[PDB]
Design a binder for this molecule. Structure first.
Ligand SMILES: Fc1cccc(-n2cnc3c(NCc4nc5ccc(F)c(F)c5[nH]4)nc(N4CCOCC4)nc32)c1
Ligand SMILES: Fc1cccc(-n2cnc3c(NCc4nc5ccc(F)c(F)c5[nH]4)nc(N4CCOCC4)nc32)c1
Lengths: 295, 295
């Protein structure tokens, strides 16, 4: 298998830059438009094609702050193809660039936007279900200060689009995302709701604070092995132990998310305010100057 | 593009586990033998096929301590196929597992074997040219204490197999490996020799000591951009600055490697002895107990 220079007649395919849920991601060019893009590919022979479903979720999400624009989705030869707005580096990339050390200021600035992105998704009737640093990207140019959220391949509806009736409490039957950032309820095999995305973001923030999480594991392990080893450790590590030595707001955040009822509407503004209050007591300036901008 | 359950009739193909030079790596089964293996695949439509060349280098290297066994190489359909002995996790995987903290004891134990692996390659007339944590794997079972070296896709001959006449001093024309661990001479566009592999190992050891290197960069960059940004930083960072706060042996090692002549035979035993002397002054026990064994 070699990639041609083009995907059909309209798209130049450049280098593979990483992976997403159920597909590989490439740089490319929309040749007719004269615009650089990102392209996600799914092999049509896959047992359960989903790219088309994912693309419809992107289309529904359009217009939200920090949601990439979808240009096209369809088939070309051996692939389904989804063409997206090109963005800046992922937060995992930028964390590495900063030697896996983010300042408290940068953590807080990121937290504010990340909570807002998640809230937006929830406003459109979906749970993201794979909250992780790789799925948040900075923008380009004048939007270099804006955090975007990506990847709707594991996203699932939590309320009816018309009635806003919440899904029933139930066991999970959906494919799941990273064990590392999964909520405790996810490890227990329970359906995710709004609280679970926010709990997972809490683990992401602690990862940025610490550089690692205490349940880090080995890639040379099956998903089954990872869930089991991480479940056991995450379940035996209190929030107060995880968050020791950091501002109390991180533990207050995590405990709030874990104490939500399955169908509660989270108080997003209260969660933002935790961090914004801390930001101002610290004497920080809300100036869009992240750690990597000083590199 | 989907992988069938088998690569031809003899090999079960399991999950993709990572990448190597010019190809992807999969778990698999040699069905006739009833043995688990690792499989490297190269698409036959690639501009410059090299897997067959790489396989011949493996065959030449056979019998060395910490060299994986090669089972077969050949064509199957749209792929060239190279079937290898299955090993344990990479040193990068294990570093992550240990939260990017290795004890001085583990660093020293690894250094001793890594210098020996490199020496072995040199004894067989090749420079490895991509010394990095991902290319060292632990063994399995009773060989769980043994470090293996892998990937000969960038390896190049530095002396004639019959005469042992060293190649002439010259500019490089070969594809190169990771900018991160490259020798300074590699950044200058000069042909690599025995000293360069050892210099690169020095950077690897410092990476294990520090958790990062001070020229760490952003994945969202072209190879050209990475070479240029890393060259400039690596070139303006003295060894004594890189190695500050660590045992002097790390700086003594790096300065020794940088002071070798292009055609010098390195004093491998002197380099090993640096670290072994330190090990004993520290009071450490040579007991094969690495950090990850305490996890
Ligand atoms: F499929 C989608 C859906 C929505 C948006 C995007 N999308 C829109 N812009 C991007 C984007 N741009 C930043 C980037 N440029 C790079 C070049 C080389 C390199 F090595 C990298 F690491 C790179 N990272 N990066 C990614 N990826 C990061 C890598 O892992 C897969 C995701 N997805 C994108 C892709
Ligand atoms: F192509 C060759 C040539 C010579 C030896 C090998 N070779 C022989 N045993 C292996 C091997 N075994 C350890 C392993 N098992 C894993 C399962 C899932 C997972 F996610 C991993 F990370 C895994 N790591 N790992 C690798 N790789 C590590 C990943 O990056 C590509 C290299 N190459 C191997 C492969």
């Amino acid at each position: 298998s070699m990639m041609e220079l083009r995907v059909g007649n309209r798209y130049r395919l450049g280098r593979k830059i990483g992976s997403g849920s159920f597909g590989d991601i490439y740089l490319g060019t929309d040749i007719a438009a004269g615009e650089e893009v990102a392209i996600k590919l799914e092999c049509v022979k896959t047992k359960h094609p989903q790219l088309h479903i994912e693309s419809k979720i992107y289309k529904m999400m359009q217009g939200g702050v920090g949601i990439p624009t979808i240009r096209w989705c369809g088939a070309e030869g051996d692939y389904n193809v989804m063409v997206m707005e090109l963005l800046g580096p992922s937060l995992e990339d930028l964390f590495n660039f900063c030697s896996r050390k983010f300042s408290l200021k940068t953590v807080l600035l990121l937290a504010d936007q990340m909570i807002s992105r998640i809230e937006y998704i929830h406003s459109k009737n979906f749970i993201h279900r794979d909250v992780k640093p790789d799925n948040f990207l900075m923008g380009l140019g004048k939007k270099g200060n804006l955090v975007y959220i990506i990847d709707f391949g594991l996203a699932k509806k939590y309320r009816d689009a018309r009635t806003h009736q919440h899904i029933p409490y139930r066991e999970n039957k959906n494919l799941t995302g990273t064990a590392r950032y999964a909520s405790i309820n996810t490890h227990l095999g329970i359906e995710q709701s709004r609280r679970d995305d926010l709990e997972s973001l809490g683990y992401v923030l602690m990862y940025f604070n610490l550089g690692s999480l205490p349940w880090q594991g080995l890639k040379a392990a099956t998903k089954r092995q990872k869930y089991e080893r991480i479940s056991e450790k995450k379940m035996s590590t209190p929030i107060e132990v995880l968050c020791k030595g950091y501002p109390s707001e991180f533990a207050t955040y995590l405990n709030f998310c874990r104490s939500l009822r399955f169908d509660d509407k989270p108080d997003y503004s209260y969660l933002r305010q935790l961090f914004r209050n801390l930001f101002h007591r610290q004497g920080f300036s809300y100036d869009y100057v992240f750690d990597w901008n000083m590199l």
